[PDB]
């Protein structure tokens, strides 16, 4: 049951640390990505007023 655990937890942990790390990239992505949407959809909006 000791091996049962080390395997079990160690397993779902490997899969949810996968989960979270992949969204941590996606997350840091979505800031820098909406930061560029900012400047883009701002230059686009700006000469749209003129």
């Amino acid at each position: 049951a000791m091996s049962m655990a080390v395997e079990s937890t160690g397993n779902a942990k490997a899969e949810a640390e996968s989960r979270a790390e992949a969204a941590r990239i996606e997350g840091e992505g979505s800031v820098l990505q909406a930061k560029l949407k900012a400047q883009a959809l701002a230059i686009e909006t700006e000469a749209e007023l003129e």
């Binding site: 959809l41 701002a42 909006t45 700006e46 007023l49």
Partner: protein, 51 residues
């Protein structure tokens, strides 16, 4: 985006409000002026004896 564009269509709305007015104002004048020329054209009592 919004603040800037809000102000846009907003300034225009105002300058095209006084535009709205001037029209309605001038026409109201020309109606009344014509109507004053009309009224005076015939007896200010003739309108009465016609009524």
């Amino acid at each position: 985006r919004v603040k800037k564009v809000r102000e846009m269509e907003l300034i225009y709305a105002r300058a095209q409000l006084e535009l709205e007015v001037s029209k309605a104002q001038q026409l109201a004048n020309v109606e009344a002026k014509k109507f004053k020329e009309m009224t005076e054209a015939l007896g200010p009592g003739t309108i009465r004896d016609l009524a």
